Write a protein that binds this ligand. Structure first.
Ligand SMILES: CSc1nc(Cl)c(C=O)c(NCc2ccc(S(N)(=O)=O)cc2)n1
Ligand SMILES: [Zn+2]
Length: 258
């Protein structure tokens, strides 16, 4: 009886195995755009993905992860609210059963169809496992998806999904360029938070881009053909793998713009 997003093991249940679920800096959160304060001390974000090396794509039973070689300084996130350098390790998405839901963060209570998470760890801690034990261990870059025109840069991901339908399946996924998933503007909101899945560790500087990317109905429909279950098990469509907004508590969301 492991955690999930099903009828009986979903977000409302996680606190039983992971008490930090009711903690002081949990994610995601609603971004109230009128209350987020412009912070002129914030820097432009620096996203350096030219040398990114993707290796593999994995269905882990909760989402799919596109995994990167992080054995040297290649693909890094710095600047913005960050001190030091954060290395890209994987990206994944959260999405809905319908276009009207799927994102984890919301914007003035608006839910997007999906949300992309580019996950980076602070190189000062040497590896990911050590980084997640620190309040400034991770930086996750969050990007909203809306349904409209196709994202050509996403299609290579969409097309490989049929080969990793069920939990535990993986496929070679080399030479994928995540620059193709970025919007035009890097304007962002930022706040201190947590992993949005168990173990829900309070180790993330969240950086959420204001500009969503557009993907097509057909592209997101293919996300929805994935399975939570393993091969040869009754089919459970991989949909609604998002955690709802959590109490903001004693935190301020800062804006990089205007
Ligand atoms: C705790 S040990 C560990 N080690 C590795 Cl090697 C990974 C690999 O990713 C990992 N991932 C957990 C994770 C959960 C949730 C999020 S989210 N939905 O907040 O962006 C990012 C990362 N956790
Ligand atoms: Zn995520």
């Amino acid at each position: 009886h492991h955690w999930g997003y099903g009828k009986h093991n979903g977000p409302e249940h996680w606190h039983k195995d992971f008490p930090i679920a009711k903690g002081e800096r949990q994610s995601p959160v609603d971004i109230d755009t009128h209350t987020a304060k412009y912070d002129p001390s914030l820097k432009p974000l620096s996203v350096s993905y030219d040398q990114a090396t993707s290796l593999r794509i994995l269905n882990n039973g909760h989402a799919f992860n596109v995994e990167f070689d992080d054995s040297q300084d290649k693909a890094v996130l710095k600047g913005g609210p960050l001190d030091g350098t954060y290395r890209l390790i994987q990206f994944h998405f959260h999405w809905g059963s319908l276009d009207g839901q799927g994102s984890e963060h919301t914007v003035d209570k608006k839910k997007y169809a999906a949300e992309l998470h580019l996950v980076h760890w602070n190189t000062k801690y040497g590896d990911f496992g050590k980084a997640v034990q620190q309040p400034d261990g991770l930086a996750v870059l969050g990007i909203f998806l809306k349904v409209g025109s196709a994202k050509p840069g996403l299609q290579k991901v969409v097309d490989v999904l049929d080969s990793i339908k069920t939990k535990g399946k993986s496929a070679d996924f080399t030479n994928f360029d995540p620059r193709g998933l970025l919007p035009e503007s890097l304007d962002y909101w930022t706040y201190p938070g947590s992993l949005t899945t168990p173990p829900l560790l309070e180790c993330v500087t969240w950086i959420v881009l204001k500009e969503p990317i557009s993907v097509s109905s057909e592209q997101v429909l293919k996300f929805r053909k994935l399975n939570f279950n393993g091969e040869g098990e009754p089919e459970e469509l991989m949909v609604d793998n998002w955690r709802p907004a959590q109490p903001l508590k004693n935190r301020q969301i800062k804006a990089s713009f205007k």
